[PDB]
């Protein structure tokens, strides 16, 4: 493998998806250099089932990067075993989740004085989500199911926007496509 994994094109993107409609980018057939993620702003870096200092020596059959924007106080919901209106209605991780969660404060880019209404979350649904399920329907709840974040630079930290990237590590009885150097 001569190609390098396009982490740069995931983390340094101008635009992130809404949490109700989280975006998945597939990483494959590449060399996974994780030093940059350790090197940087990226205040939140929690790995489950794997050590962040050993990723340089591992091989995977696939790596999946799930990108979305949430509030600072909602960052704790992006973890296995957790519940809440993000964990239950927007983005659910499995209890046996294997992977790393990276998040940073994007107030400088996403917040607006008039209010940034581009980012939305789901508040109403008839049931909870299954692991890695996505629901982007707008059917009226027996309420309009989606509501804006309205991010502003005048908000305290808990209400400031955070950009979250979840790196899921797939390990199967199959030839690896992604290996560190």
């Amino acid at each position: 493998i001569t190609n390098l994994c396009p982490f740069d094109e995931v983390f340094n993107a101008t635009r992130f998806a809404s949490v109700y409609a989280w975006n998945r980018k597939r990483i494959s057939n590449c060399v996974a250099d994780y030093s940059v993620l350790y090197n940087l702003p990226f205040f939140t870096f929690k790995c489950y089932g794997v050590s962040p200092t050993k990723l340089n020596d591992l091989c995977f059959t696939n790596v999946y990067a799930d990108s979305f924007v949430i509030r600072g106080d909602e960052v704790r919901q992006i973890a296995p075993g957790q519940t809440g209106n993000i964990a239950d209605y927007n983005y659910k991780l499995p209890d046996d989740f294997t992977g790393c969660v990276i998040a940073w404060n994007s107030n400088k880019l996403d917040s607006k004085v008039s209010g940034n209404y581009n980012y939305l979350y789901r508040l109403f649904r008839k049931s909870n989500l299954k692991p890695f399920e996505r629901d982007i329907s707008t059917e009226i709840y027996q309420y309009f199911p989606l509501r804006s974040y309205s991010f502003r630079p005048t908000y305290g930290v808990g209400h400031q926007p955070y950009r979250v990237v979840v790196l899921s590590f797939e390990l199967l009885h199959a030839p690896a496509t992604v290996c560190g150097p």
Epitope: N3, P6, E9, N12
Partner: antibody
Framework: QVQLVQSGAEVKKPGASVKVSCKAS????????ISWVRQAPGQGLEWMGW????????NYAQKFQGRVTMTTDTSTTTGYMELRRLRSDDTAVYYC????????????????????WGQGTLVTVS | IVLTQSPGTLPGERATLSCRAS???????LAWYQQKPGQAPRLLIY???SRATGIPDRFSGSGSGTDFTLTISRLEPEDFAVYYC????????FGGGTKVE
């Protein structure tokens, strides 16, 4: 230690085509795209188009949509551009640059700019 | 998106250069370039604020909405060049160019 080395000046007749090369080194070729910008004498910078070194995807400026073709060769880590049916108004210096404004793998916009530039290739039409 | 720069033509003094867009341009999609005589343009500012590697601290950019600027806190003999603004919020454009003299 990134460098971009372009071919020397060319002189063409009206209706002729010119192909300008740009050899890249000092970085992983397939991790960054290639952009082309030209500058006519006394003028500013005009964007011609962009190509991904990873998947061959292109994005051209409307002005050259039917005139310019861009290709890459990953074995020689070199970019190429061809501009067809040249006119006297196409006399300009054509520059190559390393593109970190759009991703090569996903095609999405990045937070960046054109950091590394070649010396420029002068093309004269007469 | 159309980018208009001013003044047409502007050592040790502070310099300010302006670039106004006809349409809103995101902080993430705007950059500034410098071109010396006989040389290719180089990147100075990206993300409307962050400095490119190798760029002196005297160069700083900022802005929002449709109004962005580039400031040089004191001009050096080598800072006399043509500066350009760029946006890639929609397609990719360059401004007319502003000369420091």
């Amino acid at each position: 230690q990134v460098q971009l080395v372009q071919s020397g000046a060319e002189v063409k007749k009206p209706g002729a085509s010119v192909k300008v090369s740009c050899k890249a080194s000092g970085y992983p070729f397939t991790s960054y795209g290639i952009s082309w910008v030209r500058q006519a004498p006394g003028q500013g910078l005009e964007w011609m188009g962009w190509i991904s070194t990873y998947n061959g995807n292109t994005n051209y400026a409307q002005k050259f949509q039917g005139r310019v073709t861009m290709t890459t060769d990953t074995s020689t880590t070199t970019g190429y551009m061809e501009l067809r049916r040249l006119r006297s108004d196409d006399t300009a210096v054509y520059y190559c640059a390393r593109d970190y404004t759009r991703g090569a793998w996903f095609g999405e916009s990045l937070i960046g700019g054109f950091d590394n530039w070649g010396q420029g290739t002068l093309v004269t039409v007469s | 998106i159309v980018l208009t720069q001013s003044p047409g033509t502007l050592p040790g003094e502070r310099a300010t250069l302006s670039c106004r867009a006809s349409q809103t341009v995101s902080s993430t999609s705007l950059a500034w370039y410098q071109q010396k005589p006989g040389q290719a343009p180089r990147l100075l500012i990206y993300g409307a604020s962050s400095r490119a590697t190798g760029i002196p601290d005297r160069f700083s950019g900022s802005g929002s909405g449709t109004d962005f600027t580039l400031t040089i806190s004191r001009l050096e003999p080598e800072d006399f060049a043509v500066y350009y603004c760029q946006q890639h919020d929609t397609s990719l454009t360059f401004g007319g160019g502003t000369k420091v003299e």
